[PDB]
Amino acid sequence: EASLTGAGATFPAPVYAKWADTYQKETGNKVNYQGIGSSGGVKQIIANTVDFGASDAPLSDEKLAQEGLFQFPTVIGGVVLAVNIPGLKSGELVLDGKTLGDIYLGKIKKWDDEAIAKLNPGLKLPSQNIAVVRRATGSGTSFVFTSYLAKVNEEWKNNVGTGSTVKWPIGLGGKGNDGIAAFVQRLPGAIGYVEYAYAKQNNLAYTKLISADGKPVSPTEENFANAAKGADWSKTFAQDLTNQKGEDAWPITSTTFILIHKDQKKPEQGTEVLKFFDWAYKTGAKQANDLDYASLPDSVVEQVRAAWKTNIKDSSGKPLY
Ligand SMILES: [Cl-]
């Protein structure tokens, strides 16, 4: 029986927590996961204060080598826009990239604006003020969201850019994916970006979006998976899943990563960390789908196992997988 600690991204916390609970019920091993945001996860693993870190933003090959870290992907999720709009039911409103960016730039202030009406011919939109919400500190969800905005709105790209943190043009700060969810729920007229599970599990309304190919698409497990169908995983785990071509490709999709040290000074802990994740790939797919996270293809989990044998070892150089 092992006692393990992980910390980082809130984007996948719902599935890591469920995996952890089930794993304990079946093997007795205990995994404690702290959802503190991707930046804190990177800082904590580098500081050796946790057995494993978690970040939705991938570290470059050079940064990994500099810190003696190894990175591997777990699941595929999707970022959606949770909204609190009077009269409209969930999934009713459609936004495109350009207009979404204009809302986040503060150019569009009301829900019945001409640009939103044009995208929604049949809807009776309210004259409600839009209340924009965003993340309070360094966030992996913010990284994928701003990575998307920079591709579809040039003004955003040139003045604000992409990052785990950016100089937000407008918007109240919410802490964690759960904080943005709670803000949307209490604020009539609100719009906030969150990983899908955070909107669905809290019964929040969300919008549809226009794919890179120009078609309206709904956010679903299958549609997040579709956005990764063209990913050449064999080249690198650090795949960009925003604004991808293809039928029913959710435009704001992303995978997420686990970081661990290659030279394990507590080899028993590392050995157990790998067993937890392997068990998850082997048996946890139903738990991931129940939460609407798409599973990585078997080919990718095989890449991860092969890489574990080659990179994770004790101080004498013995492989831990
Ligand atoms: Cl936060």
> Domain locations in the chain?
1-77+230-239+254-321, 78-229+240-253
What sign has the CA pseudo-torsion 98, 104, 107, 109?
positive
For residue 125 the two structure tokens come to: 């939109």
Is 162 assigned to a binding site? no
DSSP three-state, residue 153: coil
Task: Give the end-to-end CA distance of the chain in Å, rounded to a whole number.
Answer: 18
DSSP 117: H
Contact status, residue 237 vs residue 61, Cβ threshold 8 Å: no
Residue closest to 280 by CA, chosen among 256, 262, 296: 296
Whole-number Å distance between alpha carbons of 235 and 117: 42
For residue 241 the two structure tokens come to: 């899943």
Percent helix, strand and coil across the chain, each rounded to 5? 40, 20, 40
Would you tell me how many other CB atoms lie within 10 Å of the CB of residue 159?
11
Whole-number Å distance between alpha carbons of 34 and 31: 10
Contact status, residue 184 vs residue 133, Cβ threshold 8 Å: yes
Residue closest to 227 by CA, chosen among 101, 99, 96, 76: 76
Whole-number Å distance between alpha carbons of 116 and 126: 11
Would you tell me how many other CB atoms lie within 10 Å of the CB of residue 28?
9
Would you tell me how many other CB atoms lie within 10 Å of the CB of residue 4?
20
Is 9 assigned to a binding site? yes
What is the experimental method? X-ray
Q: Do domains 1-77+230-239+254-321 and 78-229+240-253 have the same CATH topology?
A: yes
Kindly list the protein residues that place their beta carbon closer than 5 angstroms to ligand 1, a single-atom ion: 37, 135-137, 175-176
Contact status, residue 80 vs residue 299, Cβ threshold 8 Å: no
Residue 136 Cα to ligand 1 midpoint, Å, equals 5
DSSP three-state, residue 73: strand
Residue 176 burial (10 A CB sphere; 0-12, 13-18, 19+): buried
Name the one residue in this structure whose structure tokens are 């698409």: 217
Whole-number Å distance between alpha carbons of 299 and 305: 10
Is 140 assigned to a binding site? yes
DSSP three-state, residue 223: helix
Question: What is the bridge-based pairing of β-strands 69-83 and 190-195?
Answer: antiparallel
Would you tell me how many other CB atoms lie within 10 Å of the CB of residue 205?
17
190 HSE (CA, 13 A, CB side): 24
Contact status, residue 19 vs residue 290, Cβ threshold 8 Å: no
Which ranges constitute the DSSP H helices of the chain? 13-27, 38-46, 61-66, 97-104, 114-119, 140-152, 154-159, 176-186, 196-200, 221-227, 267-283, 285-290, 298-311
Residue 164 Cα to ligand 1 midpoint, Å, equals 10
Contact status, residue 294 vs residue 224, Cβ threshold 8 Å: yes
Contact status, residue 98 vs residue 283, Cβ threshold 8 Å: no
Quickly count helices (H) and strands (E) in the chain.
Answer: 13, 13
Residue 8 burial (10 A CB sphere; 0-12, 13-18, 19+): buried
Q: Which residues in the chain have their C atom more than 2.5 Å from the N of the next written residue, marking a break after them?
A: none
Is 141 assigned to a binding site? yes
Query: CATH class for domain 78-229+240-253?
Result: alpha beta
- For 219-258, letters b (16+ CB in 10 Å) and e give bebebbbbbbeebebeeebbbbbbbbeeebbbbbbbbbbb
DSSP three-state, residue 42: helix
Residue 244 Cα to ligand 1 midpoint, Å, equals 27
Residue 177 Cα to ligand 1 midpoint, Å, equals 7
Whole-number Å distance between alpha carbons of 149 and 238: 19
Whole-number Å distance between alpha carbons of 89 and 206: 9
- SS3 readout for 12-31: CHHHHHHHHHHHHHHHCCEE
What sign has the CA pseudo-torsion 31, 36, 37, 41?
negative
- Stated length of the chain: 321
Q: Domain 1-77+230-239+254-321, CATH 3.40.190.10 — does that match?
A: yes
Is 11 assigned to a binding site? yes
Contact status, residue 300 vs residue 241, Cβ threshold 8 Å: no
310 HSE (CA, 13 A, CB side): 8
Whole-number Å distance between alpha carbons of 243 and 249: 8
Residue closest to 10 by CA, chosen among 33, 31, 32: 33
DSSP three-state, residue 134: strand
Residue 142 Cα to ligand 1 midpoint, Å, equals 9
Residue 310 Cα to ligand 1 midpoint, Å, equals 35
